[PDB]
């Protein structure tokens, strides 16, 4: 059972800054990691897959990186529309698992 531990539960920042959220897997998952963005009362939206590939529609502002057991989501210039929850997910082996999430507040 691959556990995904996200660094912090909450993270503060204001528009203009650069943020990095980390995801550590309890086992090697190669690069089979995806990041999702979720605003309240809405469904998750895919941002990055295969650790660093941007999905159709996500802005260059988001950049994923890492491999093996340490993954990171980076937002270089945090805009207001980026304040939301962020989850990492592993899809190398069952059961598929998610990280607890990291809330981005001002």
């Amino acid at each position: 059972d691959i556990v995904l531990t996200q660094s912090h539960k909450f993270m503060s920042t204001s528009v203009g800054d650069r943020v990095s959220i980390t995801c550590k897997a309890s086992q090697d998952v190669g690069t089979a990691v995806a990041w999702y963005q979720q605003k309240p009362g809405q469904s998750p939206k895919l941002l990055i897959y295969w650790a660093s590939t941007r999905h159709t529609g996500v802005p260059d502002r988001f950049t994923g990186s890492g491999s093996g057991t340490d993954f990171t989501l980076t937002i270089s210039n945090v805009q207001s529309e980026d304040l939301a929850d962020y989850f990492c997910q592993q899809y190398s082996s069952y059961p598929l698992t998610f990280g607890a999430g990291t809330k981005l507040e001002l």
Binding site: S43, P44, F87, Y94, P95, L96, T97, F98, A100, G101
Partner: protein
Amino acid sequence: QVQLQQPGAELVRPGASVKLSCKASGYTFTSYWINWVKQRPGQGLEWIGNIYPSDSYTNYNQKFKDKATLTVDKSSSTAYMQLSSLTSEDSAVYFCARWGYWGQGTLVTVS
């Protein structure tokens, strides 16, 4: 383009079963795996299991295997999930998803 329509809410009585639907449209229903995810306000997301529409092959979370059953209806392109012996712990938002597209979710409230 792709759409995974799920009904907004379901009110269920404790100890009973619930049947959740997920109508897919805008892509070939049989070429993509459909996953079911559970979300309770307090905790993170939790994977229940998945199903491959073409042959109904399923994978379940060890935590949800006898509690949930996954099936599809290839003629209507709908995926279904049933939960039984519902309790307060099952009240949550359940989402059906495929690569790149999640449904709106259905709020299951046991009361």
